[PDB]
Amino acid sequence: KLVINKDMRTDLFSPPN
Amino acid sequence: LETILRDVKTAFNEASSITLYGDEIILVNCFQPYNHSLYKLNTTVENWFYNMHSETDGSELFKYLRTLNGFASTLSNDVLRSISKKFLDIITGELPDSMTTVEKFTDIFKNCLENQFEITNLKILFDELNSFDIPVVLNDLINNQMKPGIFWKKDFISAIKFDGFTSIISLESLHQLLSIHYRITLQVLLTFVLFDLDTEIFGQHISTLLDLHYKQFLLLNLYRQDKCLLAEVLLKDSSEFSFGVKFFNYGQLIAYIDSLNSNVYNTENSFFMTFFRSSHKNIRFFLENVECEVQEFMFAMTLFSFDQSYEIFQLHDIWKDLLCTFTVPHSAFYYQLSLLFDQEFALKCISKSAEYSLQDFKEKQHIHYLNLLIHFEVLDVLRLGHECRTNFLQLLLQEDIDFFSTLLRLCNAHSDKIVDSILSQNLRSCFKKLYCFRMLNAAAEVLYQYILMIRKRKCYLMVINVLSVTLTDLRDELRG
Amino acid sequence: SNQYQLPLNVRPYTTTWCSQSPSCSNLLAIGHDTGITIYCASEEQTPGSTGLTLQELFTIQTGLPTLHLSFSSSCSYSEPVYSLFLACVCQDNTVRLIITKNETIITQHVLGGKSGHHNFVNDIDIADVYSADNRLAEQVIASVGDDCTLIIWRLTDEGPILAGYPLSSPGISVQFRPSNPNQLIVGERNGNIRIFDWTLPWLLTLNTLPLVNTCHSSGIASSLANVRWIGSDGSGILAMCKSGAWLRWNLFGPKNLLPNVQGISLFPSLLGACPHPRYMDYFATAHSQHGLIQLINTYEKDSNSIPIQLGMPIVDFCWHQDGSHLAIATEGSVLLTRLMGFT
Amino acid sequence: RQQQQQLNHEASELLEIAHIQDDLLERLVADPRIPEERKAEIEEFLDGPIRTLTDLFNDYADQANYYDLCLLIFHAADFHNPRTIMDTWNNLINQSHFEAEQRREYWEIVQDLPDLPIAVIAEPPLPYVYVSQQIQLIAHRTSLDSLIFPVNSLLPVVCAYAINNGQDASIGADPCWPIQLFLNLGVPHALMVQVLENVLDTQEAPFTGRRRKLVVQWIAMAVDMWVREVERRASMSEAVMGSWVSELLGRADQVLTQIAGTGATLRGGAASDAEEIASLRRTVKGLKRSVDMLLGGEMARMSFFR
């Protein structure tokens, strides 16, 4: 079961908080 | 897209400030970087174009143009396009040179204009038209306003370095001028097809106009097809001004644009077709159009980049290959085409050339033909041909080896030295014995005996039948 | 739907019913890479779903591709023997008239080279013209091409008469007016639409380009796909753009100032519209690339009717004269499909 | 047996996903272009229970442009989407080509005296070699039976790359290298020729004009291997090919005749490939001969002694 969702992710190249 | 593009453009173009480029050039700088608007002083004709529904007064030529536009503006775009096309057709010969002018105009009328306008507006136009001294006004329009000046160089500051700004401003300005010219020229030509204007008196003007319209169309087409390329060919046209230009006032700018106009209306076509080839779709209109020996070959190579191409080429008589072919100058051409499409066109051309011709060339052609046929008889033909490079044939037959066997069987049936020996050797290189036997039709017997040195019975039997001492021996062996 | 296979090595280019001649209206021709094939449509018992089946009659070999195809009124049947007259375009850029008795080509006329079109030929059509005494006086073929030329080729009693006319742009379609062979219509790629009296400037020129409703922008390049007359007196003109935009004008009463009606197909129409032979307000258009066919009603009765969707590209299509059947050539076949509503 | 297989199947699928997740985590931690702050966050969410294939793709494999692992994910998920698959193949080819060019440049600077960019560890394979290494690594992991190897779409793309990036004789590569690759990988010979036929008929760029010369050379090489295979399989059984292959070679000969003619009349001078094409004609005829003999009866008599 795979579902691509380019819309809302988490910037892999920016730190958190 | 239409709407967003328009809005984005509009936004990008929001005005911010004025810059006086040069001494006197009005420039506006826009909100979006890399976006500027130049405001250009209009020429006479441009003033007429931009002020049809205004100019209280105006010269005779203006009033004439205004009335022509008064009629032409009631026609629709499809109609006008079909008329433009027909005017191209007169130059291209799609409307045969055999026809009289009156006949081409009649063709045009019936196909494009009949039932496509209000007779009331025709009457309005005819009436207004009768006030003008037409030869004089047309003279002034063609020979003064539209056909530009012979230059003894009038200082278009030669640019030392490419100036992208003046480049795009020049091209856009040229495009505006020629678009306006195009609309005028088309409206006048229109008046020439609608009314009984002596096709002899005005013969010169008509042919000039059809010549000018055509050039206009071409340029405008190229403009929207590939601006960069158009600019590049249009500035590498002028030698001393290869890099570009600088202008510091409106006179210098107008004069430069006019200069380019001259270039268009008068070495250009060749430089540009050449640069291009080194816009696929347009050059079709413009190889049907702009082509009408050299034009023939151009049409060929263009229509190839297939039936039309091959036909034209034969009837008459990537860049590196083309150069090589030109240096050679039929065989070379077909070989090149085949290589370039390597498909139907290719194969056909190659086969035709090979046929028309009939060590290196021969071998290559043969191999190509055989491969194409085996991919789509040919074997036997090529073989008998070459027989009438042996190792080459050995390799070809090596590739051949079921279809090959069938072909061989067919050849043997038809028959009922070197070739025979080569075949025997290849076969010697159940299945094997059978093939050997079939071909030799002693060799058969020898091979069978060697293999034998159910199966036994079959072999002995086959041997006995073929022979019909040996028989007695075989019988004794089978009985023992 | 019933499906009838074309021969395995036959690539179709064009499909047309012999509606032009009532004696032969069950004849179907497929122009392909080696000639023109003739089929017959018959009412089987079938189920009266598709109460119509296709019988392949024969194949006329020509040896080269056939791109456009038109029957003439001169077609006839005899017992059996078919007497055919076909106008078509070949790979050598010639325009030809081929006259046959069944598969055997008994006669052939060829117009080509420099005397012919000087570029690619985009369209052809044919009509029979009779004198006052009513013998066959002339057969007239009209054709348009990329050489900015329209050619009228008349074959008369004392022989051929050729005439060329210049165009402002490449000719992309041409069709004589129904019930009036004295008039015809020519289409230019640029959107110009010519009405022409060849017996004679030419009478009238409309244009679809500047008329696009622009409520929805039809786009930068809306090259004219097709213009066809509608009605049996040729009372109307229909034009269709590649974009799917279409427009209809009528020709009778009073004064006129704009096209009478306008719309847009759900999809692009590379092949253009094929107007219904019985219902003026209706025409068919294909999305040839995905193999769908939309049916459009000019007075908006339609509300997006797509009776036909194949899972394959459509090469060409045409109405059977009865108005309920459709013949469609795809890349490897021809389908006969019956829409129950039109019966 | 049913209860055993259902568990062996659940463990096989979860093990396939787990290996993907492990390959990701390792690569992300080691990647120089990933900030340390993010790596600790990646290690927290991937070094634990096994995640869904959606998350692995969206939150990690797609964000870091690890297109090879994206393809393995489309395989594990039975992902039916040819267009996305081919988009991922196109990105993987281009990414690898740019990386190989970069390493050859760094090398040429060492062999000339220059200094590399700071923090760059100093004869790396030509780009087409590193590209086909990437295709092999995936193929062995997915077994070629996957929907990430639609040869009808993937072979033309690889052939397109070879043309549009000069991975041909100019740099010392075998011009047939795309064909060699997919044959050794185990694509059946008939399927290769079948695709190559479609490449030659439709004339999609770059397979147009005189570059169809190269398409014909690929067909020649594929059919040649096919013939050798049939001859080998016949000797094997002593101890399919249709007429369409023969027709295909005839059309191929016509394409070569057309290309040579066009080459002889080119503006600037005749083409230099005259004898090169004459050779290809001979090879093609030889293959049509062999194929014609096999089709004609010599294929049903392969197990028989001659």
Q: Output the DSSP codes for D154-194.
A: HHHHHHHHHHHTT-SGGGT--TTHHHHHHHHTT--HHHHHH
Strand-pairing partners, residue C334, are: C4, C329
Count Cβ atoms within 10 A of the Cβ of residue B274 and give its class: 0-12 exposed, 13-18 middle, 19 or more buried: middle
Confirm if B403 and B374 have CB atoms less than 8 A apart. yes
Chains interfacing with C (3 or more CB pairs < 8 Å): B
**CB contact, 8 Å: C182 with chain B?**
no
Residue type, D222: A
Both structure tokens of C235 = 């009372």
Please tell me what DSSP assigns to residue B74. T
Residue A13 backbone dihedrals phi, psi, to 5 degrees:
-115, 25
- Chain D residues close to B399, C-beta within 8 Å: 224, 227, 283, 286-291
Longest dimension (CA), chain D: 75
Residue type, B316: H
- Nearest one of D178, D182, D181 to D163, comparing CA atoms: D178
- Nearest one of C271, C340, C28, C291 to C283, comparing CA atoms: C271
Strand-pairing partners, residue B357, are: none
Query: C63-102 burial by CB neighbour count: b if 16+ within 10 A, else e?
Result: ebbbbbbbbbbbbeeeeeebbbbbbbbbbbbbbbbbbbee
Query: B285-299 burial by CB neighbour count: b if 16+ within 10 A, else e?
Result: bbbbbbbbeeeebbb
Give residues with Cβ within 8 angstroms of C220, minimum separation 6.
B2
Confirm if C39 and C334 have CB atoms less than 8 A apart. yes
Please state, as a whole number, how many other Cβ atoms lie within 10 Å of the Cβ of residue D90.
14
CA distance C316 to B114: 31
Query: Side by side, which strands form the sheet with C314-319?
Result: C2-5, C333-338, C325-330, C314-319
Binding-face residues of B in 424-453 toward D, CB within 8 A? 427-428, 430-436, 447, 451
Please tell me what DSSP assigns to residue B343. -
Give SS3 for B123.
helix
Confirm if C68 and C83 have CB atoms less than 8 A apart. no
Confirm if B396 and D288 have CB atoms less than 8 A apart. no
Give residues with Cβ within 8 angstroms of C27, minimum separation 6.
C17, C18, C38, C39, C40, C57, C71, C75, C82, C84
Give SS3 for B412.
helix
- Chain D residues close to B327, C-beta within 8 Å: 268-270
Confirm if C144 and C173 have CB atoms less than 8 A apart. yes
CA distance C314 to C271: 10
Binding-face residues of B in 13-52 toward D, CB within 8 A? none
**CB contact, 8 Å: D37 with chain A?**
yes
Give SS3 for D150.
coil
Strand-pairing partners, residue C81, are: C78
Confirm if B262 and B268 have CB atoms less than 8 A apart. no
Please state, as a whole number, how many other Cβ atoms lie within 10 Å of the Cβ of residue D48.
9
- Nearest one of D231, D226, D233, D230 to D248, comparing CA atoms: D226
Q: Could you tell me the end-to-end alpha-carbon distance of chain C, in angstroms, rounded to an integer?
A: 15
Both structure tokens of B152 = 């003894």
Strand-pairing partners, residue B359, are: none
Give residues with Cβ within 8 angstroms of D36, minimum separation 6.
none
* Dihedral of alpha carbons B361, B367, B371, B373, sign: positive
CA distance C296 to C281: 8
User: Best interface-test mutation with D: which of A5, A12, A17 has the largest number of D CBs within 10 A?
Assistant: A12
CA distance B107 to C203: 9
Strand-pairing partners, residue C53, are: C42
- In the block, tokens 């009513």 appear at C134
CA of C112: how far to CAs of B31, B284, B311, D15, D137, in Å?
A: 58, 19, 11, 71, 59
Both structure tokens of D193 = 């020729």
- Nearest one of B232, B241, B236 to B267, comparing CA atoms: B236
Crossing angle of helices D274-293 and B360-374, rounded to 10°: 40
* Dihedral of alpha carbons C338, C339, C342, C343, sign: positive
Please state, as a whole number, how many other Cβ atoms lie within 10 Å of the Cβ of residue A9.
12
Give residues with Cβ within 8 angstroms of D156, minimum separation 6.
D195, D199, D204, D207
Confirm if D183 and D196 have CB atoms less than 8 A apart. no
- Chain D residues close to A9, C-beta within 8 Å: 58-59, 63
Confirm if B290 and B218 have CB atoms less than 8 A apart. yes
Strand-pairing partners, residue C229, are: C237
- Nearest one of D71, D43, D65, D53 to D17, comparing CA atoms: D53
CA distance D218 to D204: 16
Experimental method: cryo-EM
Cβ–Cβ below 8 Å for D251 and B407: no
* Dihedral of alpha carbons D93, D94, D95, D99, sign: positive
Distance, in angstroms, between B121 CA and closest chain C CA? Answer: 11
Binding-face residues of D in 55-74 toward A, CB within 8 A? 57-60, 62-64, 73-74
- Nearest one of D233, D201, D247, D200 to D219, comparing CA atoms: D200
Give SS3 for B20.
strand
Residue B414's region, left for phi above 0, alpha for psi from -120 to 50, else beta, is alpha
- Nearest one of B401, B474, B466, B471 to B432, comparing CA atoms: B401
Give residues with Cβ within 8 angstroms of C133, minimum separation 6.
none
Q: How many CA atoms lie within 13 A of B391 on its CB side?
A: 0
Confirm if C46 and C53 have CB atoms less than 8 A apart. yes
Give residues with Cβ within 8 angstroms of B253, minimum separation 6.
B25, B40, B41, B169, B173, B247
Both structure tokens of D26 = 């390792």
Q: Could you tell me the end-to-end alpha-carbon distance of chain A, in angstroms, rounded to an integer?
A: 30
Residue type, D279: S
Both structure tokens of C172 = 């992309």
CA of C220: how far to CAs of B5, B182, B228, in Å?
A: 11, 19, 19
Residue C321 backbone dihedrals phi, psi, to 5 degrees:
-55, -30
Confirm if C118 and C164 have CB atoms less than 8 A apart. no
Of the partner residues A3, A12, A14, the one whose CB lies closest to the CB of residue D54: A3
- Nearest one of C300, C305, C308 to C329, comparing CA atoms: C308
CA distance C131 to B133: 45
Instruction: Give the nearest chain D residue to A3 (CA atoms).
Output: D54
Query: Side by side, which strands form the sheet with C136-145?
Result: C121-130, C136-145, C149-156, C159-166
- In the block, tokens 């008469």 appear at C161
- In the block, tokens 């080839």 appear at B277
Residue type, B177: L
Give SS3 for D269.
coil
CA of D271: how far to CAs of B294, B306, B360, B371, in Å?
A: 19, 20, 16, 22
- Nearest one of B310, B270, B190, B339 to D281, comparing CA atoms: B339
CA of D208: how far to CAs of B56, B319, D192, D269, in Å?
A: 60, 14, 19, 21
Confirm if B373 and D288 have CB atoms less than 8 A apart. yes
Count Cβ atoms within 10 A of the Cβ of residue B15 and give its class: 0-12 exposed, 13-18 middle, 19 or more buried: exposed
Of the partner residues C114, C167, C255, the one whose CB lies closest to the CB of residue B118: C255
**Alpha-carbon C99 to chain mean position:** 19
CA distance B126 to B141: 20
What own/partner pairs with CB < 8 Å and gap ≥ 24 does C227-230 have? C227/C173, C227/C175, C227/C185, C227/C187, C227/C193, C228/C173, C228/C175, C228/C185, C228/C272, C228/C273, C228/C274, C228/C275, C228/C283, C229/C175, C229/C177, C229/C178, C229/C185, C229/C275, C230/C275, C230/C280, C230/C283
**CB contact, 8 Å: D303 with chain B?**
yes
Give residues with Cβ within 8 angstroms of B137, minimum separation 6.
B60, B61, B64
Strand-pairing partners, residue D259, are: B336
User: Best interface-test mutation with B: which of D254, D267, D280, D291 has the largest number of B CBs within 10 A?
Assistant: D254
Of the partner residues D241, D256, D305, the one whose CB lies closest to the CB of residue B342: D256
Residue C127 backbone dihedrals phi, psi, to 5 degrees:
-145, 145
B129's enclosing H/E stretch is helix B119-130
Binding-face residues of D in 232-251 toward B, CB within 8 A? 234, 238, 241, 243, 245-251
Please state, as a whole number, how many other Cβ atoms lie within 10 Å of the Cβ of residue C230.
23
CA distance D162 to D178: 8
CA distance C19 to B50: 52
Instruction: Give the nearest chain D residue to B369 (CA atoms).
Output: D253
Query: SS3 for chain C, per residue?
Result: CEEEECCCCCCEEEEEECCCCHHHCCEEEEEECCEEEEEEEECCCCCCCCCCEEEEEEEEECCCCEEEEEECCCCEEECCEEEEEEEEEECCCCEEEEEEECCEEEEEEEECCCCCCCCCEEEEEEEEEECCCCCEEEEEEEEEECCCEEEEEEEECCEEEEEEEECECCEEEEEEECCEEEEEEEEECCCEEEEEECCCCCCEEEECHHHCCCCCCCCCCCCEEEEEEECCCCCEEEEEECCCEEEEEECCCCCCCCCCEEEECCCCCCCCEEECCCCCCEEEEEECCCCEEEEEECCCCCCCEEEEECCCCEEEEEECCCCCEEEEEECCEEEEEECHHHC
Residue type, C50: T
- Nearest one of B390, B318, B371 to D257, comparing CA atoms: B371
Query: D104-118 burial by CB neighbour count: b if 16+ within 10 A, else e?
Result: bebeeeeeeeeeeee
CA distance B35 to B168: 12
Pairing label, strands C180-188, C282-287: unpaired
CA distance C124 to C144: 7
Please tell me what DSSP assigns to residue D209. G
Longest dimension (CA), chain A: 30
CA distance B50 to B38: 17
Strand-pairing partners, residue C309, are: C292
CA distance B145 to D39: 73
CA distance B328 to B331: 9
Pairing label, strands C12-17, C27-32: antiparallel
Both structure tokens of B230 = 């158009």
Residue type, B386: H
CA distance C19 to B478: 78
Both structure tokens of D169 = 């004789």
**Alpha-carbon B341 to chain mean position:** 16
Residue B31 backbone dihedrals phi, psi, to 5 degrees:
-55, -40
Residues in chain B: 480
Both structure tokens of D70 = 């994206």
Crossing angle of helices B344-357 and B331-341, rounded to 10°: 160
Strand-pairing partners, residue C176, are: C184
CA distance D116 to D110: 8
- Chain A residues close to D37, C-beta within 8 Å: 15-16
**CB contact, 8 Å: A10 with chain D?**
yes
Please state, as a whole number, how many other Cβ atoms lie within 10 Å of the Cβ of residue D137.
12
B422's enclosing H/E stretch is helix B418-428
CA distance B256 to B170: 8
Residue type, C89: V
- Nearest one of B408, B478, B396, B418 to B439, comparing CA atoms: B408
* Dihedral of alpha carbons C164, C166, C170, C174, sign: negative
* Dihedral of alpha carbons B292, B294, B296, B299, sign: negative
